[PDB]
Symmetry: D2
Subunit: 264 residues, 4 copies
């Protein structure tokens, strides 16, 4: 069917992209970067993340495929030397799709209760713009804790191996429809108390962050960091939307984890 | 219907038990500690754990209710002063049942491949009997890591607020059918490498521990610690069985968590 | 001798300051905020920190005294109700001085090797201005590690109970002339490796941070955060300078720690 | 002068020992395992630890030298292929001694206040024999905290890279005369509170552990684990004694750390 290819932009990835397009020219494959059904990303996890966000409004109609040109990427599970077999297998089709959960972030402002939403494949974080970060943490309309620290991180399953991981979070299998909240350097003395442990939330649970004094927050969705002013609320929930991968061979998540962290 | 009552054994819990039995004598409630349908536990979480294990072969036919006589217990969500309202509400019935996942541990030995299974409500841990603890960690028949340390802990959801928590694990809502593995003081240098992060596993994933040199392990299921010799394998999976609680009012898990750890 | 008094600025602290000045008017005590020998800080730890930095060029000739108007401060070990006894004891003199180590940060730039130094009582941190933070860590001219993460924190002894503490650092007694380095969310996979553990350095050891790609860093000394461009090197060492406290009664550091973190 | 050689016991270490003895036979070097001045350890860190404890009553008259036959040991900073140069350099003498602090553990019992002391080069730990571990932590006769968990670890400087490290402790340079206390899986809820952070103590500070209910503790000094009954107190302090190493070339501690943990 229709397809397109994003590239990291170096000479290695651009050449691999050009050879794959020439390979695809020998089948019933039309290049179309407007409404593709197959998106191929050539580079690292960052390149894959940009591919996902470029097409986040057609997630139900796209299958993603990652090729890593350097060190093994987590979302990129094909090596450059296998690109010929990939073109051939992909042209035939009969591939099986695998779906990973996603995270929805909603930012409500004051003056009109204006509201922006974002979809994350790795995580969504909040920090303070300059001053101290203080926020009230509400779970399903229940006041859970007042958080003082450097920020918070809300991670998808497949994002738990990213940044969640460096903050002490747990790695969880992507078949679990959930989101995980981790703290960044929480203050804990006799006056200030937080839970400490990471928190894993099921679908339909809503985590809401509410400003205590300062209302300016730097919010990061995957790789893009946006400043927001006069914030009234930040809402987190497991998204109804899902990212679909094309799979041509078993590469189990824990094998993926073993290779990226233990030995390869 | 039929019911029974376990007690911590002090004068406070025994008296509360005797008054509740006298209260139950004024309804259509028969005391039967052989085949009850309602098990009431009076004491702390340990007392509740013993109640669960005493009746672990009739989990499908029993609803559990916890009363805490001292500090708030996690499984005991009724205060002593509410025992009259409990007797009355429980006598009427029309209560809603809530189910939490459980963990199954299987220990296979050498010589006959003899095999013992255990059901845990908090967690199941492994340690070495004396010598250094070394074990190969296999996930769904894939060799994941060689673990060197003091031991490992496999936790249920409702167990993540217990001991999992002190080992750095994440707290996860009991609606998530999963198990979480945490490390006890893993060795990590240039020669010895483990994942570090806790691991959360979905239903039907099988974590298997295999002895490397020493084959004697002290295994703990909730509160009981048993020594096993000539161990060939330890298998962990989310159990098919579930513990059922009787609920007469909303006490949300995160409110339970807030009260036990933040403030009350 | 000569003295001055800083205040948090609220009505409580300003009134306490005015009453202490009137109390000091009945002794041989001259108010002089240019060249004092006694600096009294009225407020919290932040107020004390500002008092220290305001007079950091006369540390050898000043003794500091902290009064906390709200929650117990760590550097402020006098309650408001004891201000009369403080004025009286302080007027007599015969007090014993206690000295805490300090940290020296040196920032060398390109183009002229221009160089700025700062003195910290809590800690000095480095972060990236926007982009990813990557730095080579050199200890006494030995390349120790390439650090990838959110930043680093270099703490004094008395600063280890502050921010060092929230990053997993150890609390160390101020009699130990040392500095402690902690990581902020280090990346650790198969390609990127850091030590993980905090590092404690003796006097005369020099920790040097060197930019790898990006050369813009947001550097924070205690409470003030300054952006630096075209940075070539950041050097850390235990300072030759020391902060001196006036002590009128034993308040041991571990008792101070117990009261601020365990119970009071 | 006089010397002796301990060996791991495998064919590699025994042969290396025999060749070094034959090499030493060509100088003014007498073999004497009763009162040596040079102790050479051939094996790993465990072999070195046993060498240290075998001669712990003559620490002031002995210099230690480590050769590692397998993976790089931390106390063994010579490779097997350098044994000839070692024999030659060691025979000449004119070597410089380097001294590391040590830890003293004192166990007082009931009935006669009987008292045993131990010297540790790595660490000394306490655990419970079977039941739950509960202990009151007293610092210089000040009640600091009631600890509930799996145990505690008191580490020397050179021991902080060992086991202290796996418990979250800081790595500190051996020139710092100090000891570091780390927790094993402390319980922390609304009723039970510990400090959490590791604690670093200077010389002359005395940490004392006092039983709360159970008085039986399994105490481990380096590699030997001894059970003690009717314990009244466990006292920790930096020892007056020191271990002396023979050094023939600069191998800085942080280079040693880099090679054992970062890359080699
Ligand atoms: N303190 C932090 N610690 C750990 N991760 C962090 C930290 N801060 C941000 N991140 C992650 O970076 C993503 C953004 N990256 C793009 C990426 C990525 C990614 N995704 C996953 C995943 N799902 N599982 C396992 N490894 C993953 N990596 C790996 O991550 C590395 C890339 N990061 C950087 O070096 C810094 C950066 O920010 N770079 C920009 C591009 C590479 O090895 C890549 O294969 C943020 O979304 C945040 O998750
Ligand atoms: N290092 C450890 N850190 C933390 N927890 C640990 C540790 N070692 C064992 N455990 C837990 O103890 C359970 C066994 N306990 C019985 C209990 C319990 C329990 N269960 C939960 C839960 N699900 N959520 C939240 N708090 C919980 N607590 C609370 O736990 C305390 C009781 N523990 C002890 O003081 C020690 C003990 O072992 N005592 C025996 C009886 C009480 O406040 C109780 O309300 C082991 O199963 C292991 O989970
Ligand atoms: N993620 C962090 N976690 C922990 N501490 C952090 C974090 N980020 C910065 N800091 C510290 O703040 C100091 C700056 N503060 C002034 C302060 C302070 C201070 N110093 C010590 C000490 N030596 N020991 C023990 N508690 C201490 N506190 C206590 O700290 C609290 C004040 N912090 C804030 O709420 C935020 C802030 O930044 N506020 C500005 C004023 C109060 O309870 C105060 O009694 C930075 O220097 C950094 O150390
Ligand atoms: N959970 C734990 N995590 C980490 N360390 C632990 C743990 N439990 C005990 N220890 C240490 O073991 C010493 C006893 N060991 C002998 C040893 C050792 C040693 N000392 C240092 C040091 N000072 N710096 C850096 N690495 C060190 N190692 C390295 O340690 C490894 C040996 N350990 C084991 O595999 C297990 C064991 O116990 N084995 C017996 C012999 C080897 O790579 C060795 O080069 C206990 O004293 C305790 O410190």
């Amino acid at each position: 069917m229709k397809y397109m290819i994003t590239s990291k932009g170096d000479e290695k990835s651009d050449l691999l992209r050009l050879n794959m397009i020439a390979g695809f020219g020998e089948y019933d494959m039309e290049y179309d970067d407007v409404e593709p059904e197959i998106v191929i990303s050539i580079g690292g996890d960052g390149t894959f993340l940009s591919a996902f966000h470029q097409y986040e409004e057609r997630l139900d109609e796209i299958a993603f495929i990652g090729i890593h040109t350097g060190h093994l990427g987590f979302y990129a599970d094909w090596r450059p030397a296998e690109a010929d077999k990939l073109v051939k297998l992909l042209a035939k089709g009969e591939y099986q799709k695998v779906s990973y959960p996603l995270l929805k972030t909603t930012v409500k402002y004051g003056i009109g209760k204006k509201e922006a939403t974002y979809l994350a494949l790795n995580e969504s974080t909040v920090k303070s713009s300059g001053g101290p970060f203080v926020v009230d943490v509400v779970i399903n309309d229940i006041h859970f804790e007042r958080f003082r620290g450097d920020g918070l991180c809300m991670s998808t399953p497949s994002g738990t191996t990213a940044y969640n991981k460096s903050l002490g979070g747990a790695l969880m299998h992507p078949s679990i429809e959930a989101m995980q909240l981790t703290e960044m350097a929480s203050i804990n003395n006799r006056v200030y108390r937080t839970i400490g442990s990471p928190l894993v939330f099921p679908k339909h649970h809503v985590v809401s962050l509410q400003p205590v004094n300062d209302k300016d927050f730097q919010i990061s969705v995957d790789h893009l960091s946006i400043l927001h002013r006069d914030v009234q609320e930040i809402r987190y929930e497991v998204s109804a939307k899902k990212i679909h991968f094309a799979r041509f061979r078993s590469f189990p998540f824990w094998r993926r984890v073993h290779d990226s962290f233990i030995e390869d």
